[PDB]
């Protein structure tokens, strides 16, 4: 049976492993049929997977929303921890231009509560920080929603240091999203002592010697190697909930399978051995 684990300390609990919704909406031409977008949300909770997440900025004015909206209907919310985000505000060839204004951050909140079809969301995140406007008043605006019950939790995506321990002074924050892989590691020297010192869960988020020293070891613990990498992974600790996506179901449960997987800190070591932005102040 699927794991639980308390992501954050406020009280957030999670399957151990969650669910990408990103990759249902597809692209602007060949994508995914509601039907099957739909299906793969129910089979994920089927396989015990209650943590979905999602973005306002992800398919089509909302569109990504849109469908685990309507995949809820069919599913018992309130077993299920919606995650979703804000702030990113438009993408071009200039890149990304992140909004954080407390104003931007009540009507991104209304608009993904109207399109998920919700009354609250229980995980909101700041999906890139405004460098405009200090860390503080960004948060400020969703302390506000948490108490109004609009929002549960708080998350952050990609902040550096300085954001993190100046957005938790504010409110505490319950999770960071961040890329943590294998080949990845970035996060460990700073990101994640300091999410181990304020108690913020972390949630990862999407020569050839190399590849047969991997699969051989995968070989040797009987699973895939995406399931290896995952596995990996997962076992970086109990405050560490990785949210893979995909758009087909096979994918989906040799996704799951990975939890079957049980690694010694001798057989992570071998794994891994085996594989060489401020907010101003005030």
Same mark, same amino acid.
């Given at each position: 049976?699927?794991?639980?684990?308390?992501?954050?300390?406020?009280?957030?609990?999670?399957?151990?492993?969650?669910?990408?919704?990103?990759?249902?909406?597809?692209?602007?031409?060949?994508?995914?049929?509601?039907?099957?977008?739909?299906?793969?949300?129910?089979?994920?909770?089927?396989?015990?997977?209650?943590?979905?997440?999602?973005?306002?900025?992800?398919?089509?004015?909302?569109?990504?929303?849109?469908?685990?909206?309507?995949?809820?209907?069919?599913?018992?919310?309130?077993?299920?921890?919606?995650?979703?985000?804000?702030?990113?505000?438009?993408?071009?060839?200039?890149?990304?231009?992140?909004?954080?204004?407390?104003?931007?951050?009540?009507?991104?909140?209304?608009?993904?509560?109207?399109?998920?079809?919700?009354?609250?969301?229980?995980?909101?995140?700041?999906?890139?920080?405004? /460098?405009?406007?200090?860390?503080?008043?960004?948060?400020?605006?969703?302390?506000?929603?948490?108490?109004?019950?609009?929002?549960?939790?708080?998350?952050?995506?990609?902040?550096?240091?300085?954001?993190?321990?100046?957005?938790?002074?504010?409110?505490?924050?319950?999770?960071?999203?961040?890329?943590?892989?294998?080949?990845?590691?970035?996060?460990?020297?700073?990101?994640?002592?300091?999410?181990?010192?304020?108690?913020?869960?972390?949630?990862?988020?999407?020569?050839?010697?190399?590849?047969?020293?991997?699969?051989?070891?995968?070989?040797?613990?009987?699973? /895939?190697?995406?399931?290896?990498?995952?596995?990996?992974?997962?076992?970086?600790?109990?405050?560490?909930?990785?949210?893979?996506? /995909?758009?087909?179901?096979?994918?989906?449960?040799?996704?799951?399978?990975?939890?079957?997987?049980?690694? /010694?800190?001798?057989?992570?070591?071998?794994?891994?051995?085996?594989?060489?932005?401020?907010?101003?102040?005030?």
């Amino acid at each position: 049976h699927m794991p639980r684990v308390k992501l954050g300390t406020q009280g957030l609990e999670v399957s151990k492993l969650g669910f990408g919704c990103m990759g249902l909406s597809g692209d602007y031409n060949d994508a995914l049929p509601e039907e099957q977008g739909i299906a793969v949300i129910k089979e994920a909770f089927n396989c015990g997977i209650t943590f979905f997440d999602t973005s306002d900025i992800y398919g089509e004015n909302g569109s990504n929303e849109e469908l685990l909206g309507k995949a809820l209907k069919q599913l018992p919310r309130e077993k299920i921890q919606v995650g979703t985000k804000f702030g990113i505000h438009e993408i071009g060839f200039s890149g990304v231009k992140a909004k954080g204004t407390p104003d931007y951050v009540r009507s991104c909140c209304e608009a993904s509560l109207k399109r998920l079809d919700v009354d609250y969301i229980d995980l909101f995140y700041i999906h890139r920080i405004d /460098t405009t406007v200090p860390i503080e008043i960004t948060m400020g605006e969703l302390k506000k929603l948490v108490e109004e019950g609009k929002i549960k939790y708080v998350g952050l995506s990609e902040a550096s240091p300085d954001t993190i321990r100046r957005a938790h002074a504010v409110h505490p924050v319950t999770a960071l999203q961040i890329e943590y892989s294998l080949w990845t590691r970035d996060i460990e020297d700073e990101i994640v002592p300091l999410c181990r010192q304020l108690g913020i869960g972390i949630v990862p988020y999407s020569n050839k010697q190399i590849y047969y020293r991997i699969e051989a070891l995968s070989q040797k613990h009987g699973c /895939t190697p995406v399931q290896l990498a995952l596995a990996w992974v997962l076992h970086q600790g109990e405050d560490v909930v990785p949210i893979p996506g /995909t758009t087909k179901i096979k994918n989906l449960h040799n996704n799951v399978g990975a939890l079957k997987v049980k690694l /010694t800190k001798e057989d992570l070591k071998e794994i891994s051995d085996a594989v060489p932005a401020n907010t101003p102040p005030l």
